[PDB]
Enzyme design. Structure first.
Site, PDB file in Angstrom:
ATOM      1  CG  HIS A 238       3.380   4.689  -5.621  1.00  0.00           C
ATOM      2  ND1 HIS A 238       3.702   3.502  -6.222  1.00  0.00           N
ATOM      3  CD2 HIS A 238       2.781   4.488  -4.578  1.00  0.00           C
ATOM      4  CE1 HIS A 238       3.248   2.593  -5.328  1.00  0.00           C
ATOM      5  NE2 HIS A 238       2.784   3.257  -4.289  1.00  0.00           N
TER       6      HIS A 238
ATOM      7  CG  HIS B  19      -1.657   6.179  -4.423  1.00  0.00           C
ATOM      8  ND1 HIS B  19      -2.869   5.058  -4.001  1.00  0.00           N
ATOM      9  CD2 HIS B  19      -0.759   6.360  -3.421  1.00  0.00           C
ATOM     10  CE1 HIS B  19      -2.212   4.519  -2.965  1.00  0.00           C
ATOM     11  NE2 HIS B  19      -1.088   5.232  -2.628  1.00  0.00           N
TER      12      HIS B  19
ATOM     13  CG  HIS C  22       0.574   7.060   2.081  1.00  0.00           C
ATOM     14  ND1 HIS C  22      -0.455   7.642   1.464  1.00  0.00           N
ATOM     15  CD2 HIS C  22       0.949   5.922   1.447  1.00  0.00           C
ATOM     16  CE1 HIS C  22      -0.827   6.917   0.307  1.00  0.00           C
ATOM     17  NE2 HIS C  22       0.095   5.637   0.293  1.00  0.00           N
ATOM     18  CG  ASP C  23       2.860   6.249  -1.248  1.00  0.00           C
ATOM     19  OD1 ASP C  23       3.809   5.553  -0.703  1.00  0.00           O
ATOM     20  OD2 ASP C  23       1.866   5.698  -1.689  1.00  0.00           O
TER      21      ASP C  23
ATOM     22  CG  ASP D 138      -1.163   2.557   0.803  1.00  0.00           C
ATOM     23  OD1 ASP D 138      -1.296   3.063  -0.311  1.00  0.00           O
ATOM     24  OD2 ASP D 138       0.086   2.561   1.606  1.00  0.00           O
TER      25      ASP D 138
HETATM   26  C1  LIG Z   1      -3.303  -3.655  -6.662  1.00  0.00           C
HETATM   27  C2  LIG Z   1      -1.976  -3.907  -6.126  1.00  0.00           C
HETATM   28  N1  LIG Z   1      -1.165  -4.920  -6.285  1.00  0.00           N
HETATM   29  C3  LIG Z   1      -0.090  -4.997  -5.730  1.00  0.00           C
HETATM   30  C4  LIG Z   1       0.799  -6.142  -6.237  1.00  0.00           C
HETATM   31  C5  LIG Z   1       1.924  -6.452  -5.746  1.00  0.00           C
HETATM   32  C6  LIG Z   1       2.499  -5.389  -4.671  1.00  0.00           C
HETATM   33  C7  LIG Z   1       3.750  -5.489  -4.301  1.00  0.00           C
HETATM   34  O1  LIG Z   1       4.469  -4.639  -3.634  1.00  0.00           O
HETATM   35  N2  LIG Z   1       3.858  -6.791  -3.867  1.00  0.00           N
HETATM   36  C8  LIG Z   1       5.187  -7.318  -3.258  1.00  0.00           C
HETATM   37  C9  LIG Z   1       6.015  -7.772  -4.375  1.00  0.00           C
HETATM   38  C10 LIG Z   1       7.665  -8.383  -3.823  1.00  0.00           C
HETATM   39  C11 LIG Z   1       7.158  -9.375  -2.813  1.00  0.00           C
HETATM   40  C12 LIG Z   1       6.136  -9.244  -1.707  1.00  0.00           C
HETATM   41  C13 LIG Z   1       6.581  -7.892  -0.829  1.00  0.00           C
HETATM   42  C14 LIG Z   1       7.042  -6.794  -1.424  1.00  0.00           C
HETATM   43  C15 LIG Z   1       7.926  -7.022  -2.842  1.00  0.00           C
HETATM   44  C16 LIG Z   1       5.876  -6.173  -2.273  1.00  0.00           C
HETATM   45  C17 LIG Z   1       4.879  -8.441  -2.459  1.00  0.00           C
HETATM   46  C18 LIG Z   1       1.650  -4.264  -4.622  1.00  0.00           C
HETATM   47  C19 LIG Z   1       0.521  -3.942  -5.228  1.00  0.00           C
HETATM   48  N3  LIG Z   1      -0.329  -3.070  -4.632  1.00  0.00           N
HETATM   49  C20 LIG Z   1      -0.259  -1.852  -3.699  1.00  0.00           C
HETATM   50  C21 LIG Z   1       1.059  -1.366  -3.163  1.00  0.00           C
HETATM   51  C22 LIG Z   1       0.861  -1.302  -1.743  1.00  0.00           C
HETATM   52  C23 LIG Z   1       1.979  -0.780  -0.977  1.00  0.00           C
HETATM   53  O2  LIG Z   1       1.975  -0.795   0.526  1.00  0.00           O
HETATM   54  C24 LIG Z   1       1.396  -1.838   0.776  1.00  0.00           C
HETATM   55  C25 LIG Z   1       1.162  -1.739   2.566  1.00  0.00           C
HETATM   56  C26 LIG Z   1       0.419  -0.623   2.465  1.00  0.00           C
HETATM   57  C27 LIG Z   1       0.256  -2.664   2.964  1.00  0.00           C
HETATM   58  C28 LIG Z   1       3.077  -0.510  -1.651  1.00  0.00           C
HETATM   59  C29 LIG Z   1       2.983  -0.552  -2.985  1.00  0.00           C
HETATM   60  C30 LIG Z   1       2.157  -0.940  -3.786  1.00  0.00           C
HETATM   61 CL1  LIG Z   1       2.154  -1.116  -5.453  1.00  0.00          CL
HETATM   62  N4  LIG Z   1      -1.505  -1.191  -3.950  1.00  0.00           N
HETATM   63  N5  LIG Z   1      -2.166  -1.860  -4.920  1.00  0.00           N
HETATM   64  C31 LIG Z   1      -1.552  -2.905  -5.051  1.00  0.00           C
HETATM   65 MG   LIG Z   2       3.847   3.782   0.016  1.00  0.00          MG
HETATM   66 ZN   LIG Z   3       0.165   4.278  -1.170  1.00  0.00          ZN
END
Ligand SMILES: Cc1nc2ccc(C(=O)N[C@]34C[C@H]5C[C@H](C[C@H](C5)C3)C4)cc2n2c(-c3cc(OCC(C)C)ccc3Cl)nnc12
Ligand SMILES: [Mg+2]
Ligand SMILES: [Zn+2]
Length: 341
Positions: free
Chosen positions: A81, A85, A121-122, A233
């Site tokens: 982040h 990004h 946004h972040d 995102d």
């Molecule tokens: C490659 C990839 N893998 C990822 C694997 C897992 C998770 C992740 O946070 N999973 C969970 C873990 C817990 C249980 C569930 C609910 C939350 C707590 C989030 C799923 C996010 C991933 N991610 C993101 C990402 C997207 C974000 O905003 C998303 C909105 C815009 C739609 C925020 C943060 C992130 Cl890191 N961007 N790329 C990736």
């Molecule tokens: Mg975010």
């Molecule tokens: Zn983001």
């Protein structure tokens, strides 16, 4: 004085043509993370110019130069982040504009807000999620936990604080109504980046796609903006395998650092955040199948030219399956030693 000199060049040297950045800069095959970070603020300006926002909204160039630098400066350096990004998300926004004809769906001001929101946004992300703010009783949770989307409320407030910094309000010549509209859009779009929000509106997104986009429907505009923002995102997944693999590595470094902090505080971290439990291929397959793929499927349903995006994400998902066996140690480790037991 570093920002000073950077600003001086950004303002007085002129905005470089978008074609000069890279010949495939407006293609879905382009990887914006390949652009040196020192070239990214100029590339933001180039994109803004090419989308004609600078001319259409008569944005003051000194103010815009200051704004772009302040936004870049408003990102910290966690593994994932960070500014690179925000830059790549913003670039994907530009790609949607260039490839999907957004002007057939959205108002000009809505597209402008989407891009500015992508940049911001972040803002000030500290490398931890919403759950961690509450568990650690952070200042951000004290401010926002009662409302939810703690980090996303903070990102939006950071964006506003930048606008409210003297010399940085790129909208301050706007009408009262347009100014209010722009800030409202930024609120909605940035808050749409909380996964909890996406999960809440998903059925509505499906219903929009199946009944068909109605440009005269104000709710459809709002839903589409949320979907486009979430597509931006997650746009690292729409590139080659090398991008997907590198982003997994940044994401899990960031996650496992949070997990280590949770262990020190006596709390049981999420499994995906626990370096002792997390099985990365299965975690990524689950993220792709439950989160990323359904989003790019909705995008394809609404924009047929977005088909290649969904196919690439599905392809990258399959690759995790193909390489999963390599996470099993067969034979001996390369050092011929079983010491690691
Ligand atoms: C490659 C990839 N893998 C990822 C694997 C897992 C998770 C992740 O946070 N999973 C969970 C873990 C817990 C249980 C569930 C609910 C939350 C707590 C989030 C799923 C996010 C991933 N991610 C993101 C990402 C997207 C974000 O905003 C998303 C909105 C815009 C739609 C925020 C943060 C992130 Cl890191 N961007 N790329 C990736
Ligand atoms: Mg975010
Ligand atoms: Zn983001």
């Amino acid at each position: 004085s570093a920002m000073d000199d950077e600003y001086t060049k950004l303002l007085h040297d002129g905005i470089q043509p978008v074609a000069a950045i890279d010949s495939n800069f407006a293609s879905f095959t382009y990887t914006p993370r390949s652009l040196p970070e020192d070239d990214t603020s100029m590339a933001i300006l180039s994109m803004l110019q090419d989308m004609n926002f600078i001319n259409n909204y008569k944005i003051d160039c000194p103010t815009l130069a200051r704004f772009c630098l302040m936004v870049k400066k408003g990102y910290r350096d966690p593994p994932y982040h960070n500014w690179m990004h925000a830059f790549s998300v913003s670039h994907f926004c530009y790609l949607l504009y260039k490839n999907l004809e957004l002007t057939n769906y959205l108002e000009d001001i809505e597209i402008f807000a989407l891009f500015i929101s992508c940049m911001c946004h972040d803002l000030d992300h500290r490398g931890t999620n919403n759950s961690f703010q509450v568990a650690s009783k952070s200042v951000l949770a004290a401010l926002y936990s009662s409302e939810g989307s703690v980090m996303e409320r903070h990102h939006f407030a950071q964006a506003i604080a930048i606008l409210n910094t003297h010399g940085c309000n790129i909208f301050d010549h706007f009408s009262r109504k347009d100014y209010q509209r722009m800030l409202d859009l930024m609120r909605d779009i940035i808050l749409a980046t909380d996964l909890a929000h996406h999960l809440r509106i998903f059925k509505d997104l499906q219903k929009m796609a199946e009944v068909g986009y109605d440009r005269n429907n104000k709710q459809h505009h709002r839903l589409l903006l949320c979907l486009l923002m979430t597509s931006c995102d997650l746009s690292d997944q729409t590139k080659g395998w090398k991008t997907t693999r590198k982003i997994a590595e940044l994401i899990y470094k960031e996650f496992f650092s949070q997990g280590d902090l949770e262990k020190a505080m006596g709390n049981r971290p999420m499994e995906m955040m626990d370096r002792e439990k997390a099985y990365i291929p299965e975690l990524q397959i689950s993220f792709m199948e439950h989160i990323a793929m359904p989003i790019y499927k909705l995008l394809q349903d609404l924009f047929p030219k977005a088909a290649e995006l969904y196919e690439r994400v599905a392809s990258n998902r399959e690759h995790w399956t193909k390489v999963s066996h390599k996470f099993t140690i067969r034979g001996l480790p390369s050092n011929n030693s079983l010491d690691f037991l």
